């Protein structure tokens, strides 16, 4: 299976004749706590539909991350538009030190000892994309050693 | 040890006294850039032989005058008026900063 | 005169002293010159008195003036056992 969290659930509203008709968007994260994470962002006319839909995207948008003793092989910083995220490995006694959004993410990757910091825009969607992208860039020592 | 500095003769209008511009580099304490701060010392030239534009070594000493506490340890170089000019330019520009 | 005396450290009702060569007119807890040994008046610890014999032997040689309660300990430390 996979574990899953409803990170963000916002309602957007488009105006038209008659007035505002709403739509729900949802950030949903899905992982195994073993390096696998999926950032689902489904939107639909209703919460359970979007959430159900959102997790569906996450399961297909999975990405496995190279954990190392509960942390990451190196710190990283991703500029996702205005969201500037900074993550940083830590000792096994440290724990996860993050805003709610990425903490929710890394707690599903299996990460349990990580120092982070959100700079720039803290838009939870954009934050999440930078997080999933940063996880998409991590590399073990052997990987780079293979590259060189 | 007595402090030893090396600057250029930038003024000798005073009897037995010459003005030595001491330039010292050092990193900025916060911005890490190495900056050049100059300084003028009125070393005691008892013979008034060191002339203008002469790179010399001055040394800490017992206070000769209110403004003097250094003597020329020895000459280092002469004919360095180019340095003196840059000083003269600086004090010259001060006229352009009035109101 | 540069003297040798015990300054009070520790806390209320827990005296701890430093046999220390120091100028006389300093306050008794001010800046001393050389901590040349501590002292447990209450003897709570086994090695409740450890003083360097030689340095007192040095400072005495150079003109030290230990107070009686100090010289009580140097002899008790055996610095004078010559």
């Amino acid at each position: 299976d996979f574990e899953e969290k409803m990170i963000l659930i916002r309602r957007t509203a488009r105006m038209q004749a008659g007035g505002r008709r709403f739509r729900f968007g949802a950030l949903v994260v899905v992982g195994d706590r073993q390096g696998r994470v999926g950032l689902g962002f489904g939107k639909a006319p209703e919460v359970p539909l979007a959430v159900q839909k959102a997790g569906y995207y996450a399961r297909r948008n999975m990405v496995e991350v190279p954990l190392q003793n509960g942390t990451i092989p190196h710190e990283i910083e991703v500029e996702f538009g205005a969201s500037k995220i900074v993550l940083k490995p830590a000792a096994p006694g440290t724990g996860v030190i993050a805003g709610a959004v990425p903490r929710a993410i890394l707690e599903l990757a299996g990460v349990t000892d990580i120092l982070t910091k959100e700079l720039g825009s803290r838009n939870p969607i954009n934050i999440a994309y930078a997080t999933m992208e940063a996880l998409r860039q991590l590399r073990t020592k052997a990987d780079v050693e293979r590259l060189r | 040890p007595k402090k030893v500095l090396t600057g250029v003769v930038v003024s000798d209008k005073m009897q037995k006294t010459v003005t030595v511009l001491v330039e010292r580099q050092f990193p900025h304490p916060l911005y890490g850039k190495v900056i050049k701060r100059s300084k003028k010392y009125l070393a005691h030239d008892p013979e008034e032989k060191y002339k203008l534009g002469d790179v010399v070594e001055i040394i800490e000493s017992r206070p000769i005058s209110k403004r003097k506490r250094f003597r020329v340890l020895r000459l280092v170089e002469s004919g360095r008026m180019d340095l003196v000019e840059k000083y003269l330019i600086r004090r010259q520009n001060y006229e352009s900063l009035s109101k | 005169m540069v003297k040798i005396r015990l300054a009070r450290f520790g806390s209320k009702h827990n005296p701890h002293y430093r046999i220390v060569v120091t100028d006389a007119r300093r306050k008794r807890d001010g800046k001393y010159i050389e901590k040349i040994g501590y002292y447990d008046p209450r003897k709570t610890t086994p090695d409740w008195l450890k003083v360097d014999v030689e340095r007192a032997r040095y400072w005495l040689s150079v003109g030290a003036q230990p107070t009686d309660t100090a010289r009580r300990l140097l002899r008790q430390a055996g610095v004078f056992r010559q």
Binding site: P92, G93, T94, G95, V96, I97, A100, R103, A104, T112 | - | -
Partner: protein, 208 residues
């Protein structure tokens, strides 16, 4: 000081059968048995989705209330635990398992950590001969703890040893029923501890 009010409800509030009384901990009259839901007027109602803070809050409130320690002393120990090296979780735990009454209760001399304080706080136990009554005392490894000889004649302590006539003790300890004595062998390990807690959460509760 220590918590003094009703104690079943903390489990009902925590929603987990933490052990706080001894017998009624294990009775079918356990409050977790009959009403396994939070106390109060809104108790039975549909539990809402807990926030991150609430979860981590419940964790610390879970662990902390396991030991009755003040928030301060719990917090004080954390920084001391935090300043030390290694996995701060287990380090922070062993100190918690290094408390005098906790070692007492863990040694089985009391049917409840709350009651164990009474033994400590009433001087009914000596630490390596020294009759210590600091409930917050830290028992180091290889230390001997036994009932006061005057406390030896006490029947409740007998009743506790009556229970420990065949009951066992955690691997970091060593007990003598007939001697009424115990020895703290080593730092209790995280694996050794059966604490129903994700202290990792409790770490982050002080990371905020």
């Amino acid at each position: 000081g220590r918590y003094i009010g009703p104690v079943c409800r903390l489990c009902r509030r925590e929603g987990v059968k933490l052990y706080l009384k001894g017998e009624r901990c294990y009775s079918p009259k356990c409050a977790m048995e009959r009403r396994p839901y939070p106390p109060g007027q809104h108790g039975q109602k549909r539990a809402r989705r807990p926030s991150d803070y609430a979860v981590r809050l419940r964790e610390k409130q879970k662990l902390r209330r396991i030991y009755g320690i003040s928030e301060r002393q719990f917090r004080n120990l954390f920084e001391e635990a935090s300043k030390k090296k290694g996995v701060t979780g287990s380090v922070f735990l062993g100190l918690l398992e290094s408390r005098l009454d906790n070692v007492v209760y863990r040694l089985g001399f009391a049917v409840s950590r709350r009651q164990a304080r009474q033994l400590v706080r009433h001087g009914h136990i000596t630490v390596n001969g020294r009759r210590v009554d600091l409930p917050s005392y830290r028992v180091r490894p290889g230390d001997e703890i036994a009932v006061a000889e005057k406390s030896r004649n006490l029947e409740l302590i007998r009743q506790n040893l009556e229970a420990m006539k065949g009951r066992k003790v955690g691997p970091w300890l060593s007990l003598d029923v007939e001697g009424m004595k115990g020895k703290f062998l080593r730092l209790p390990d995280r694996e050794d501890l059966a604490l129903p807690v994700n202290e990792q959460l409790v770490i982050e509760f002080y990371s905020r």
